[PDB]
Amino acid sequence: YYPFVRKALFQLDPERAHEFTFQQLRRITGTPFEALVRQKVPAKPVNCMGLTFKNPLGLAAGLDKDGECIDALGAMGFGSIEIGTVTPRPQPGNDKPRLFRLVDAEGLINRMGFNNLGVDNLVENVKKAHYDGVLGINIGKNKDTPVEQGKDDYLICMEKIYAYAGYIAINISSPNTPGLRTLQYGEALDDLLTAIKNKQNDLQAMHHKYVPIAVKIAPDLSEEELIQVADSLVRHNIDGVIATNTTLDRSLVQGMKNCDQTGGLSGRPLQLKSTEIIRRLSLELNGRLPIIGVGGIDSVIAAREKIAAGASLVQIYSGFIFKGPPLIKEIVTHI
Amino acid sequence: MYYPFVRKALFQLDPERAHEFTFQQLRRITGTPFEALVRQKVPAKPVNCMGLTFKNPLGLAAGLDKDGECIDALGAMGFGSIEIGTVTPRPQPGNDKPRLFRLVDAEGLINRMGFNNLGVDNLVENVKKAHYDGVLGINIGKNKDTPVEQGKDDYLICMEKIYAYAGYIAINISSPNTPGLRTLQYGEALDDLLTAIKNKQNDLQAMHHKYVPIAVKIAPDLSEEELIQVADSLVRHNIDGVIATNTTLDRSLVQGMKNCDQTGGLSGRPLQLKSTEIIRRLSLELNGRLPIIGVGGIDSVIAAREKIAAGASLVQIYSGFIFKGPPLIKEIVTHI
Ligand SMILES: Cc1cc2nc3c(=O)[nH]c(=O)nc-3n(C[C@H](O)[C@H](O)[C@H](O)COP(=O)(O)O)c2cc1C
Ligand SMILES: CCCCCC/C=C/Cc1[nH]c2ccccc2c(=O)c1C
Ligand SMILES: CCCCCC/C=C/Cc1[nH]c2ccccc2c(=O)c1C
Ligand SMILES: O=C(O)c1cc(=O)[nH]c(=O)[nH]1
Ligand SMILES: O=C(O)c1cc(=O)[nH]c(=O)[nH]1
């Protein structure tokens, strides 16, 4: 029963509880000791972006920033695991405390700031993994890098991970990297997607391997902004879109502790917004490219809601914290 | 006391029997020191709606206590309002068993009860014995054999017998389980029914010297045009509120799941999203002119807040109560 584990883990600070949880998972990942966390789940393959996904449920990015527990996490059922976000150089991200739990809303607020050990380190961890699901590597801009030259940060990363990644996630949706979201808009975006799509072709010829590229978008786009983003992805033949990241919105959590904290809200208070975004995106993309729906998913029905709204795959993070491994099994089994 | 264990035990019984067994025990501990086995202390959150003052914004939706047999016990659990019914003028047995089905992985239900109830006179006798300090809703409908074009008579008969005792009156024209009933939601039929109902209200107010507000409970399967029509009629006829929404014929979210093809109304989590869309569109068309009670897949604080954001002034639960227990009454009332 996870509810008893969660009471205990919740007595610890959000980030401290994470550090502790992963300390443990790191001592067992890729060893027979992952029997402690293994959960059998039905096969439920899905073709998406030219890959076969073991099953439609994925671990959204942010949990295993550095790719330390891929094997252990896969043992829990995930048909895909998105590691990252990594950056070319390591950085510690924003200042603690930067992670807060809205328990009664089953949501999380975070201004982490791309806290990662960098891309070289991630690649070394990924070489130790033996995960038969699809591995996505999420990549981002270094804080100090000027947003005008952010492409350089993304292309460096692509070169080092291309040979080890199932799919690559372009993160331009973090509200905790100053100015980063602007990379979703206008000519900035068009500029970046051309860099990326060019490197991809290069790297395909270099490595003789086909790797899809997916852009992760924020949920706080306007209707016009979303129309422009959808048009852009289609025009640059981006293989997929991850919708969505965390939100600056707070309309559903007023009067709750840590409501006023700065950062991105996730979990149940993002569920509806995230579904709306996907539905409008689906209507715009009209089947021209797949959507990976993440945002507030915390039950079979909610997962299926994102499927009905247009998504070909779903990803979980906050609901994984609040409902634990059992959610993995519910969803894969019944989606 | 811990609900998930209570739930596991009760789910060993078929849904109708689980309910009957539960209600038998509630009835048995009403008026005893074992009434505290269920009493819950919840924060007061007073809201004015339809000219009444609700303890809190959370009501028990109609269907759980069809005959008003457990008002006191259900009230002890913390509901701000209790909607009993649906009742019909004459008693009637409803549709044939099996008629009620759990979708446990969906945290949903399907039902085709067909207004199984002892009749409006039996209920007023129960209501007289009740001691509930919250707002008492009373939900009325058409007897099966009564013709659809004459259905209003059955509603009016009921209003006459319940006016003295109702806190508000709910008009059920949204059951998918009584043939043709949902057609009273359309055109000249809605218009005619609302006229007769509002004129009865006027005669009854004059005869009892008090105004009992009337809310119409609509279905979630209306289209956009039908919903605008429903809004417009409710306003022009000065109906005091709308309760949105009842069960849905939709099954798109429960495909591939045991019982998903059983005929009837789907409720619980697979209805939350649609019930919210309805409320939002209804709210735009009503533009604050009359209040909306929000029922439909509410199973958590955020789900409740989502309905409020969509335009509802109050909310009700049924399925979520079954699946999550009184902890949900407390959670919502506390953080809504
Ligand atoms: C078994 C059952 C019986 C119901 N009976 C009635 C009823 O008699 N009158 C009514 O207006 N609604 C009735 N309903 C609808 C509920 O009041 C409620 O509107 C609906 O289930 C949606 O809310 P929910 O998702 O919380 O269950 C019934 C629902 C169920 C599941
Ligand atoms: C029992 C198997 C462990 C599965 C991992 C789920 C729990 C992780 C610990 C954890 N991480 C977090 C990560 C990010 C934000 C909040 C938390 C948080 O509040 C807790 C308690
Ligand atoms: C905590 C004490 C009372 C709690 C009330 C919640 C349970 C009510 C009994 C009940 N009704 C139902 C009504 C309709 C459909 C299914 C059920 C069902 O499966 C169960 C178990
Ligand atoms: O670490 C972060 O602030 C962050 C990154 C990202 O892509 N999304 C998010 O909600 N937070
Ligand atoms: O008891 C019933 O069949 C019934 C009545 C009603 O008004 N709504 C519903 O979904 N069922």
PDB file of C-alpha atoms in Angstrom, chain A residues 228-330:
ATOM      1  CA  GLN A 228       1.527  29.650 -34.403  1.00  0.00           C
ATOM      2  CA  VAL A 229       3.435  26.931 -32.542  1.00  0.00           C
ATOM      3  CA  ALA A 230       1.459  24.122 -34.156  1.00  0.00           C
ATOM      4  CA  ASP A 231       2.015  25.649 -37.583  1.00  0.00           C
ATOM      5  CA  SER A 232       5.739  25.869 -36.884  1.00  0.00           C
ATOM      6  CA  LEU A 233       6.250  22.259 -35.837  1.00  0.00           C
ATOM      7  CA  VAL A 234       4.408  20.969 -38.922  1.00  0.00           C
ATOM      8  CA  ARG A 235       6.449  23.260 -41.202  1.00  0.00           C
ATOM      9  CA  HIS A 236       9.775  22.030 -39.788  1.00  0.00           C
ATOM     10  CA  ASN A 237       8.653  18.367 -39.810  1.00  0.00           C
ATOM     11  CA  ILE A 238       9.147  17.933 -36.084  1.00  0.00           C
ATOM     12  CA  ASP A 239       8.291  14.356 -35.224  1.00  0.00           C
ATOM     13  CA  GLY A 240       6.237  15.015 -32.091  1.00  0.00           C
ATOM     14  CA  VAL A 241       5.054  17.482 -29.486  1.00  0.00           C
ATOM     15  CA  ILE A 242       4.981  17.031 -25.694  1.00  0.00           C
ATOM     16  CA  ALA A 243       2.014  18.945 -24.226  1.00  0.00           C
ATOM     17  CA  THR A 244       2.420  20.250 -21.648  1.00  0.00           C
ATOM     18  CA  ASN A 245       4.816  21.545 -18.981  1.00  0.00           C
ATOM     19  CA  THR A 246       3.921  23.280 -15.703  1.00  0.00           C
ATOM     20  CA  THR A 247       1.771  26.398 -15.405  1.00  0.00           C
ATOM     21  CA  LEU A 248       2.052  29.869 -13.926  1.00  0.00           C
ATOM     22  CA  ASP A 249      -1.679  29.644 -13.241  1.00  0.00           C
ATOM     23  CA  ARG A 250      -2.911  29.518  -9.662  1.00  0.00           C
ATOM     24  CA  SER A 251      -6.660  29.965 -10.090  1.00  0.00           C
ATOM     25  CA  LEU A 252      -7.516  26.539  -8.673  1.00  0.00           C
ATOM     26  CA  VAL A 253      -5.337  26.643  -5.550  1.00  0.00           C
ATOM     27  CA  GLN A 254      -5.958  30.072  -3.986  1.00  0.00           C
ATOM     28  CA  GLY A 255      -6.086  29.864  -0.224  1.00  0.00           C
ATOM     29  CA  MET A 256      -3.803  26.816  -0.041  1.00  0.00           C
ATOM     30  CA  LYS A 257      -0.353  26.692   1.487  1.00  0.00           C
ATOM     31  CA  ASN A 258       2.499  27.459  -0.926  1.00  0.00           C
ATOM     32  CA  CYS A 259      -0.053  28.798  -3.452  1.00  0.00           C
ATOM     33  CA  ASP A 260       1.841  32.075  -3.694  1.00  0.00           C
ATOM     34  CA  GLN A 261       5.214  30.394  -4.264  1.00  0.00           C
ATOM     35  CA  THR A 262       6.966  31.210  -7.527  1.00  0.00           C
ATOM     36  CA  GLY A 263       7.256  28.514 -10.165  1.00  0.00           C
ATOM     37  CA  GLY A 264       5.275  25.940 -12.121  1.00  0.00           C
ATOM     38  CA  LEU A 265       2.162  24.260 -10.810  1.00  0.00           C
ATOM     39  CA  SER A 266       1.716  20.604 -11.744  1.00  0.00           C
ATOM     40  CA  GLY A 267      -0.543  17.772 -10.691  1.00  0.00           C
ATOM     41  CA  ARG A 268      -4.293  17.864 -10.476  1.00  0.00           C
ATOM     42  CA  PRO A 269      -4.501  21.728 -10.650  1.00  0.00           C
ATOM     43  CA  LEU A 270      -3.010  21.481 -14.138  1.00  0.00           C
ATOM     44  CA  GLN A 271      -5.093  18.570 -15.361  1.00  0.00           C
ATOM     45  CA  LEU A 272      -7.909  20.481 -17.067  1.00  0.00           C
ATOM     46  CA  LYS A 273      -5.719  23.246 -18.526  1.00  0.00           C
ATOM     47  CA  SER A 274      -3.400  20.600 -19.924  1.00  0.00           C
ATOM     48  CA  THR A 275      -6.286  18.759 -21.551  1.00  0.00           C
ATOM     49  CA  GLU A 276      -7.668  21.937 -23.129  1.00  0.00           C
ATOM     50  CA  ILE A 277      -4.266  22.731 -24.609  1.00  0.00           C
ATOM     51  CA  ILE A 278      -3.983  19.275 -26.173  1.00  0.00           C
ATOM     52  CA  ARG A 279      -7.501  19.386 -27.647  1.00  0.00           C
ATOM     53  CA  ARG A 280      -6.828  22.727 -29.337  1.00  0.00           C
ATOM     54  CA  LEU A 281      -3.426  21.499 -30.480  1.00  0.00           C
ATOM     55  CA  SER A 282      -4.904  18.302 -31.880  1.00  0.00           C
ATOM     56  CA  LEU A 283      -7.502  20.336 -33.723  1.00  0.00           C
ATOM     57  CA  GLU A 284      -4.703  22.469 -35.171  1.00  0.00           C
ATOM     58  CA  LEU A 285      -2.277  19.648 -35.989  1.00  0.00           C
ATOM     59  CA  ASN A 286      -5.116  17.542 -37.448  1.00  0.00           C
ATOM     60  CA  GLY A 287      -3.144  14.317 -37.350  1.00  0.00           C
ATOM     61  CA  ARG A 288      -0.063  15.787 -39.016  1.00  0.00           C
ATOM     62  CA  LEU A 289       2.173  14.971 -36.030  1.00  0.00           C
ATOM     63  CA  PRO A 290       1.735  12.993 -32.773  1.00  0.00           C
ATOM     64  CA  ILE A 291       1.173  14.478 -29.310  1.00  0.00           C
ATOM     65  CA  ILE A 292       2.502  13.160 -25.989  1.00  0.00           C
ATOM     66  CA  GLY A 293       0.054  14.333 -23.374  1.00  0.00           C
ATOM     67  CA  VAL A 294       1.394  15.133 -19.894  1.00  0.00           C
ATOM     68  CA  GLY A 295      -0.302  17.251 -17.263  1.00  0.00           C
ATOM     69  CA  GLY A 296      -2.274  16.278 -14.181  1.00  0.00           C
ATOM     70  CA  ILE A 297      -2.811  12.648 -15.191  1.00  0.00           C
ATOM     71  CA  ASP A 298      -3.622  10.760 -12.000  1.00  0.00           C
ATOM     72  CA  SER A 299      -6.019   7.939 -12.984  1.00  0.00           C
ATOM     73  CA  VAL A 300      -7.067   5.729 -15.900  1.00  0.00           C
ATOM     74  CA  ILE A 301      -9.942   8.010 -16.842  1.00  0.00           C
ATOM     75  CA  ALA A 302      -7.761  11.108 -16.844  1.00  0.00           C
ATOM     76  CA  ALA A 303      -5.230   9.334 -19.041  1.00  0.00           C
ATOM     77  CA  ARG A 304      -8.034   8.364 -21.423  1.00  0.00           C
ATOM     78  CA  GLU A 305      -9.184  12.001 -21.326  1.00  0.00           C
ATOM     79  CA  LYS A 306      -5.840  13.041 -22.826  1.00  0.00           C
ATOM     80  CA  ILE A 307      -6.203  10.233 -25.397  1.00  0.00           C
ATOM     81  CA  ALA A 308      -9.673  11.451 -26.349  1.00  0.00           C
ATOM     82  CA  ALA A 309      -8.305  15.012 -26.616  1.00  0.00           C
ATOM     83  CA  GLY A 310      -5.736  13.941 -29.187  1.00  0.00           C
ATOM     84  CA  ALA A 311      -2.713  12.427 -27.537  1.00  0.00           C
ATOM     85  CA  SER A 312      -1.066   9.218 -28.733  1.00  0.00           C
ATOM     86  CA  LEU A 313       0.861   8.773 -25.473  1.00  0.00           C
ATOM     87  CA  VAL A 314       0.620  10.000 -21.895  1.00  0.00           C
ATOM     88  CA  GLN A 315       3.316  10.879 -19.340  1.00  0.00           C
ATOM     89  CA  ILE A 316       3.067  11.084 -15.494  1.00  0.00           C
ATOM     90  CA  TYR A 317       5.051  12.920 -12.773  1.00  0.00           C
ATOM     91  CA  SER A 318       2.975  14.562 -10.064  1.00  0.00           C
ATOM     92  CA  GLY A 319       0.418  11.754 -10.019  1.00  0.00           C
ATOM     93  CA  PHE A 320       3.277   9.310  -9.636  1.00  0.00           C
ATOM     94  CA  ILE A 321       4.325  11.075  -6.439  1.00  0.00           C
ATOM     95  CA  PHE A 322       0.795  11.198  -5.053  1.00  0.00           C
ATOM     96  CA  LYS A 323      -0.444   7.762  -6.106  1.00  0.00           C
ATOM     97  CA  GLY A 324       2.825   5.824  -6.497  1.00  0.00           C
ATOM     98  CA  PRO A 325       3.639   2.766  -8.622  1.00  0.00           C
ATOM     99  CA  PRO A 326       0.046   1.484  -8.502  1.00  0.00           C
ATOM    100  CA  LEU A 327      -0.871   4.291 -10.925  1.00  0.00           C
ATOM    101  CA  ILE A 328       1.550   2.843 -13.465  1.00  0.00           C
ATOM    102  CA  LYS A 329      -0.292  -0.471 -13.297  1.00  0.00           C
ATOM    103  CA  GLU A 330      -3.813   0.971 -13.353  1.00  0.00           C
TER     104      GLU A 330
END
